[PDB]
Paper text:
To address these problems, a novel glycosyltransferase YojK from Bacillus subtilis 168 with the ability to glycosylate Reb A to produce Reb D was identified. To solve the solubility problem of plant-derived glycosyltransferases, YojK, a Leloir O-glycosyltransferase from B. subtilis 168, was selected to determine whether it had the catalytic ability to glycosylate Reb A to form Reb D, as it exhibits prominent glycosylation activity to various substrates like other bacterial glycosyltransferases with a large acceptor binding pocket. Then, the purified YojK was used to determine the glycosylation of Reb A. To our delight, it was found that Reb D was well synthesized by YojK with UDPG as the glycosyl donor, which was confirmed by LC-MS and NMR. Based on the catalytic mechanism of UDP-glycosyltransferases in the catalytic process, catalytic residue H14 of YojK firstly takes a proton from the hydroxyl group of the glucosyl unit at the C19-carboxylate position of Reb A to generate nucleophile, which then adopts SN2-like mechanism to attack the C1 carbon of the glucose of the sugar donor UDPG to form the β-1,2-linkage.
To better understand the molecular mechanism of YojK to catalyze the formation of Reb D from Reb A, we solved the crystal structure of YojK in complex with uridine diphosphate (UDP) and refined it to 1.90 Å solution. It consists of two monomers in each asymmetric unit. Similar to other bacterial glycosyltransferases, it folds a typical GT-B characteristic conformation containing two different β/α/β Rossmann domains connected by a variable loop region (V210-P224): a flexible N-domain (M1-F209) and a relatively rigid C-domain (F225-M405), which can be verified by superimposing the crystal structure of YojK with another bacterial glycosyltransferase YjiC. The flexible N-domain will allow YojK to accommodate various acceptor substrates, while the rigid C-domain contains a typical plant secondary product glycosyltransferase (PSPG) motif (Y288-Q329) with high conservation of sequence and structure, which is responsible for recognizing and binding the sugar donor. Similar to other glycosyltransferases, the catalytic site (H14-D107 catalytic triad at YojK) locates at the cleft region and closes to the center of the sugar donor and the acceptor substrate, and most of UDPG binding sites (except Y288 and D328) are highly conserved. However, the substrate binding pocket is highly plastic and flexible, and a large substrate binding pocket is observed in the crystal structure of YojK, indicating that it has an ability to accommodate diverse substrates, like the large substrate Reb A. With the crystal structure of YojK, we next performed structure-based engineering to improve its catalytic activity for the glycosylation of Reb A to produce Reb D. Probably due to low binding affinity between Reb A and YojK according to its enzymatic parameters, the crystal structure of YojK in complex with Reb A and UDPG was not obtained.
Author numbering:
A (entry chain A): 2 to 59, 62 to 137, 151 to 218, 222 to 405
B (entry chain B): 2 to 58, 62 to 410
């Protein structure tokens, strides 16, 4: 069948989609993937057609997490971006032949396009599953009028501001297991909890970490403007008996940091899945992808949440006993060292990380995702005839 | 397409806009240009429609010794932002515009844009300013705490009103004087810009905007055309400088060539000391035509004057008086294109010695040519129109496509 995929502008959204697109292609699907130019190479590597839409970020990069955020302003930028992307894509696809639509769950545009084409549609949810459980500013005026335009014309059914990034499809594919999800039992059969979507991705000196203990540190791809934290890591981990792989993001130069201790390997970006296979501990911001990848590879965590859903993922890691949280406000050299030591020392963390990892692996990954979608498309094509 | 342009009340804001408007008109844009009456004739000579707003200026006949308060300036601009947007919306509300262009330092241009819900582009006639840059400029004009500022509560009340009633979207004091559009056209090169790497692609660095201006032949060019020419100007604001003009008359009376001295529109040449026989003294000159012909420029370090002199590869002596002149003076000294005199060290002897050091000097001449090439290389008025027109294309195509879907 002919599939229209619309992604979200972030590496945490694109990465899990790759395994699903790979699986669908192998099972006969012919895929057109819309995304921002930044992530083009990740899609062209599957030999899938890439098409561009305008990158409405600019924020989504070089964040401290200390920034002034107007929820309602952010919502306006999102809703304006939705209208623009839906208008752009529909104009290109309106006379093309697609059997169904896949889209990133946080890009309302994808649901709008599926409504415009009147096709079956499937959302890919890279956060926890979210329902209602989980706005009177200088930008509030536009918000309400954007939402009205989208509701009237683009069948967006935006009731609450929370609806704006919770665009459920016919199924919502969730890249966790019911074993990790907060309030898992509130989510019905249309939430397919497949756990992590893990496959080979698009240099790293692996010979330097072969037969070394590995401690991995990364604040992900957005909240990585963390010079003070990276300098604290250097003092905390210099006596680690092994190698410390530190990902510092694509903005801070290594030379802007204090002198790098001889046991560190510092890079802007690392093959994170390959590092985690070798890692005995992961110091993470609690991004859902980084957290779920770490637990998938049975790595205990120290979570330093910066923003968005990281606070709810940090809370969940601590609740199930697979790691320990340090709030950014409580970060010191001493507490960071004591916390790293505790999570490596206390075998409880590694055992719980293994248990969650088994649950995440048992959920079936990109294969279960692609199988559920195809089965749902077979069933609509069948119940149609009936 | 139909363009609404909203200018800032100062010659340094109007002048670079001239080249952009000419480029857009010559690609068949129809432009309406709001400004103060003072600049009418610069705008009407483009054969675009000039329209008035009230001159709320403070911004003329200054010495640079006047103490100014940041919070006070905020409140001046917020009050005038409210008056200008009210007046302009009343006049344009029945008209059909495709997009807005406005001076980066006029919040009213952004207010009018989101009030017509149109795409918008800001023209930045200073260096590009991010929060860090904006805080050092604001810092110069703050004595104590925000709380204890006479105008603080007044700033908060104006800002509430402008958000509630003028969809002004002010979040930090900087929103009032740094009103980024969909793009921000900056009239400098990344080469001359401090912290250039910190500005993303929505900042379009076009260098200077240089074209023939209205009143361009008013001057006796025949008298300077084949002579060594020394040009002196303290710009259009910080030109209340009788004592400095007197020092120039003395210091340059032996100059082997012509001295063109612009004294501004407030001090009568009759109030100065005797004018030497090699001087042409005028309240205002066609400054681009003078710099074409100048061997040296003694400037206050205004962004436009400095960037216009460097464009024509003129080495500089810079005597910064206020505002962004200290940071443009530091940039001139950093690129080796001129020498700075601090106003506190200004003497007849130090003025003579500095002019003598820069005149004919290979080092300043080579460094002035090198930065002038950085400035000319950024693409000017033409690159400014290309970038704006591209953005209007996509926003128009998007709007009209959405209409067709409806
Ligand atoms: O050096 C790096 C840093 C990050 N990532 C990947 O980037 C994604 C980050 O997503 P996450 O949800 O953890 O956080 P975000 O960057 O969205 O905050 C994950 O798939 C990581 O494996 C990686 O491959 N290499
Ligand atoms: O006799 C004069 C004096 C000034 N200007 C123009 O006025 C502007 C002054 O701007 P600047 O940013 O240099 O200084 P300000 O006057 O804003 O301090 C520049 O475009 C000059 O070319 C001019 O044409 N003739």
């Amino acid at each position: 069948a002919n599939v229209l995929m619309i992604g979200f502008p972030g590496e945490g959204h694109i990465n899990p989609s790759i395994g699903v697109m790979k699986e669908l292609k192998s099972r006969g699907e012919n895929i057109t993937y819309y995304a921002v130019k930044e992530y083009k190479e990740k899609i062209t590597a599957l030999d899938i057609e890439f098409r561009e839409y305008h990158d409405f970020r600019g924020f989504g990069k070089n964040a401290t997490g200390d920034e002034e955020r107007d929820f309602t302003e952010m919502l306006c930028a999102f809703l304006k971006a939705c209208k623009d992307i839906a208008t752009h894509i529909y104009e290109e696809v309106k006379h093309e032949s697609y059997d169904y639509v896949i889209y990133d769950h946080h890009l309302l545009a994808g649901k709008v396009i599926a409504n415009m084409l009147k096709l079956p549609r499937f959302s890919l949810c890279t956060t926890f599953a979210m329902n209602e459980e989980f706005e009177d500013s200088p930008h509030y005026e536009s918000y309400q009028q954007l939402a009205e335009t989208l509701n009237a014309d683009f069948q967006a059914e935006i009731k609450k501001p929370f609806d704006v990034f919770l665009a459920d499809g016919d199924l919502t594919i969730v890249f966790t297991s019911r074993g990790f999800q907060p309030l898992a039992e509130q989510f019905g059969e249309r939430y397919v909890f497949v756990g992590p979507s893990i496959t080979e991705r698009a240099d790293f000196p692996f010979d330097q970490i072969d037969n070394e203990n590995v401690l991995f540190i990364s604040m992900g791809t957005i909240f990585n403007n963390q010079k003070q934290f990276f300098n604290q890591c250097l003092e905390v981990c210099k006596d680690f008996d092994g190698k410390v792989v530190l990902s510092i993001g694509k903005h801070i130069k290594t030379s802007e940091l204090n002198d790098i201790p001889e046991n560190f390997i510092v890079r802007p970006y690392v093959p994170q899945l390959e590092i985690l296979k070798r890692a005995s501990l992961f110091v993470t911001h609690g991004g859902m992808n980084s957290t779920s990848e770490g637990l998938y590879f049975e790595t205990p965590l120290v979570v330093i949440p910066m923003g968005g859903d990281q606070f709810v993922v940090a809370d969940q890691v601590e609740k199930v006993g697979a790691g320990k949280v340090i709030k950014k406000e409580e970060l010191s050299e001493s507490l960071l060292k004591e916390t790293i030591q505790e999570v490596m020392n206390n075998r409880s963390y590694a055992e719980k990380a293994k248990e969650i990892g088994q649950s995440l692996k048992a959920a079936g990954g990109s294969k279960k995702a692609a199988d559920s979608i195809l089965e749902a498309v077979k069933q609509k094509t069948q119940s149609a005839n009936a």
